[PDB]
Design a protein around this nucleic acid. Sequence first.
DNA 1: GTCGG
DNA 2: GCTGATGCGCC
DNA 3: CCGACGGCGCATCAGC
Length: 324
Amino acid sequence: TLNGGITDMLTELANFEKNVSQAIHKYNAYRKAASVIAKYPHKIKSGAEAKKLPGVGTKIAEKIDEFLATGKLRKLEKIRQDDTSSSINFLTRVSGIGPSAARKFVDEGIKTLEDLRKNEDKLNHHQRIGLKYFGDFEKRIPREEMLQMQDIVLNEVKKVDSEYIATVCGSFRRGAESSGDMDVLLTHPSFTSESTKQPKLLHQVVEQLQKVHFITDTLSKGETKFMGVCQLPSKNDEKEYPHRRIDIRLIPKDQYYCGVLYFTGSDIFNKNMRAHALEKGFTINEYTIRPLGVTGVAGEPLPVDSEKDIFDYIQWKYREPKDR
DNA sequence: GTCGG
DNA sequence: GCTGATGCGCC
DNA sequence: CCGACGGCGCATCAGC
Ligand SMILES: *CC[C@H](OP(*)(=O)O)[C@H](O)COP(=O)(O)O
Ligand SMILES: [Mg+2]
């Protein structure tokens, strides 16, 4: 795209701040500045020009000015040549290894995947799985597979109980050619916010999907949400499919469609819809949609039976998952 | 790092 | 054995 | 000039 050099620089600076410096806000800033520049329909000639965009401040401008003039950034070259920084930045790619564990490993002389395999005793359950499917988790999922994966989930959910309502959200629901992982939202007439659940409602779906050898491993499981690994059935004639990340979140029926809206995305869209709601005098979150009183106090949660209901409440024209 | 009170 | 703090991850 | 910038489910560990 236009200004591929500047965006890469910023995204590289962002990763450094998150993984090495452990400054989450600086990371979010550099990410913000990188995204707005990526959409920009020109080629930035000066830092003063880039500063006119929202999220680009004084310091990023003086960075853009340096990059365009010199070709490479003085700071990043210092980070690139640093053994500790680059090593810490690598390990954080492994699922279960955040900045904290990463630094702890590199300080103890563990820098590469070879070292992680050699020292599996020092890894937790999550990190072991993160290492096992390291390459597989960095592969994107083509829509062709996601469709085949969906059919298995929805049918196997139907196999346990007909009353279950399974909805695959994320990029896939917006109709993207490729998706990062599978994000499934589950609910049942039995489960609501007021009247609590008898457990083994999510479990039965997870236990069923394991029975048909779809779910391979488990990263985390509890009452509400589950996180683990799944694999499509080997065609036998062809080579086996790569392992994929799956998430199954069990949500109360009354606040399902409020959940479906939030987990459908995108971030920019939710941020714009939530911003408009405040202008119209309503407050929406992951869970519920509520009215803001005269004094600016949230009332009782309003009834919702679809996504349309939320769009109606804030007198907004219904947008299809394609245009999110 | 950038924004807004 | 319990309860709170903290790392990690989602968009 | 200075505080906000994501609140939460689950796994793990510290402290009692
Ligand atoms: C690149 C500009 C940085 O500003 P921030 O608000 O993190 C630094 O202040 C410049 O110093 P460097 O990081 O040592 O180059
Ligand atoms: Mg600006």
